[PDB]
Amino acid sequence: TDYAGNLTRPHWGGAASDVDIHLEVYQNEVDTRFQYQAMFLGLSSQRSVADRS
C-alpha cells in the first residue's frame, strides 16, 4: 500500500516531487582502456635512416 502521499522529498523538485535532481557524487576517476607496451624493440635490428635517405 502506502504510508502518506504528502512528503517533503529533499531533492525531488517538481510540481509532484517526481523528477530527480540529486547532485551526482563524482570522484575524479575515468576509465579509458587497458594499456599495452611494445616488446619488439629488442626483437629486431634498428637501422636509422633519418635525415639521410
Binding site: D20, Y26, V30, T32
Partner: protein
Amino acid sequence: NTYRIDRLNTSSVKGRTSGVALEPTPVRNDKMLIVVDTVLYIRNPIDYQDDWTAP
C-alpha cells in the same frame, strides 16, 4: 542517490603519404550512473500477549 564514473574512448592510427592531410578524429566519451532506489527491510511484529506468554 546517484554516482558518476566517466568513460573515454581511443583513437585509431592512420597512415599518410607525402602531401596528404592528417584527418582529425574525435575521442568519444560518456558517463555511468548508479542510483540507490530500494530499501531492503525485515519487519517482525510480536504481539504483547505472545511476549507475555513466551520466552
